[PDB]
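Quick question: what would this complex look like in 3D?
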Amino acid sequence: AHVWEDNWDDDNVEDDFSNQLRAELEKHGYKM
Amino acid sequence: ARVVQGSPEVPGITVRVLQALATLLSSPHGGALVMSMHRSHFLACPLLRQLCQYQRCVPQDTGFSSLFLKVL
Amino acid sequence: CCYHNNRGIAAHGVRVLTNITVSCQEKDLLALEQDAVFGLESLLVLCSQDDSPGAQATLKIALNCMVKLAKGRPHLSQSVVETLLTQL
């Protein structure tokens, strides 16, 4: 029931390394 | 552009290609507005235009709709 | 059932029509190709402006049919993609 089979960005396809990366990276929320 | 939509309905019945897509995009936008009830007074004018076009030449329009472009 | 009022039956019908198109290549089916592609965009403009999980599943089914239809018959595919940009 997925349109794009080679989608890198689904609901939950994020491995552990990317999980702590997202955890420490979404918190700041600013970019220069 | 109610008169322009009424005029193009007969041209759309004859040959539309891309005008039928514009008419469908215009009508469903009014339908979504009517879902939000944001003063969508646009479907009644298209219905009156379709009724007038049917009353003008019923048989040619019916044959073009049921023979040439059933999908539109 | 592709030109039916309910969204789910339209999705099932457009799946059936897409699957007939992608499958066997007899000549006196090719006209349905035209019907097929118009069906998709018609269904799309029904299920874009709704924002409900049933309409979201209808989007899934329709877009999977769009991909498969463009994949099987490439000569329709260009028309396919331009219609998609309109609803974008």
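Answer marked as accepted. The helical segments of chain B are 2-14, 19-35, 44-56, 58-68.
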